[PDB]
Paper text:
In the present study, we elucidated the crystal structure of Mycobacterium tuberculosis H37Rv HigA2 (hereafter referred to as MtHigA2), which contains an HTH motif.
Form I belonged to space group P212121 and was determined to 2.0 Å resolution, form II packed in space group P43212 and was determined to 3.2 Å resolution, and form III was solved in space group P3121 to 3.4 Å resolution. All dimers share the β-lid as their major dimeric interface, but the position of the α-helix bundle varies. When the different dimers are aligned based on a single HTH motif from one monomer, the corresponding motif in the dimer pair shows a different relative position. The flexibility in dimerization leads to drastic changes in the locations of positively charged residues on the HTH motif, including His54, Arg56 and Arg59. To predict the physiological dimer, each form was submitted to the PISA server to calculate the strength of the dimer interface. Interestingly, all of the forms had similarly favourable dissociation energies (ΔG): −14, −15 and −17 kcal mol−1 for forms I, II and III, respectively. This suggests that the flexibility of the β-lid does not impact the formation of a stable dimer and is likely to contribute to function. The three different crystal structures in our study reveal the flexibility in dimerization mode while anchored by the β-lid.
Numbering used by the authors:
A (entry chain B), B (entry chain A): 27 to 101
Write the structure that this text describes.
C-alpha cells in the first residue's frame, strides 16, 4: 500500500543519517508534513513540498503522466 | 515553463470533450483547483488532487526519485 512508498522515502534521509528535524529545516518544511510523508502519506502534500524533501537529500523528483503509447512530464 | 506543462494538460482534457466543470465533478475535486492546476500551478498542487485529475483524463500519474542513473517509484 503506502508502506512500500513510506520506505521509498524513509531511506533517502537514513542514507545521510539525519534526523526528521534536521531534514525539515534542511528542506524548509513543516516537520509535521515531513513526518507525514515519511509515513507513506504524500497524497496530502504539495508537489513542491515533496520536491524539496527529495532535493534536500540529493535526489531529482520526476512527475510524469502516462496515457497511452507515450508519457508527458510535469516536473 | 510550468505553464506549458499545464497547457499540455488543458489540451488532453479538451480532446476528450470535457469542460473544467465536468473534470472537477468527475474526480470529485473542487473546480477551483483544476483551473489553477491547468493554469500551470503544478508545484502548489496537492499530490492526490493531481492524481485525481490526471485519472479523470484517463492517465496514470507517476512519481519517481532519480538518484544516480537508477530511479525509484513512489506513485
Amino acid at each position: 500500500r503506502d508502506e512500500v512508498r513510506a520506505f521509498r522515502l524513509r531511506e533517502l534521509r537514513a542514507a545521510q543519517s539525519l534526523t526528521q528535524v534536521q531534514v525539515a529545516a534542511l528542506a524548509h518544511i513543516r516537520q509535521s508534513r515531513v513526518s507525514s510523508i515519511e509515513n507513506g502519506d504524500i497524497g496530502s502534500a504539495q508537489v513542491n513540498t515533496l520536491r524539496k524533501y527529495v532535493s534536500a537529500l540529493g535526489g531529482e523528483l520526476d512527475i510524469t503522466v502516462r496515457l497511452g503509447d507515450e508519457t508527458f512530464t510535469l516536473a
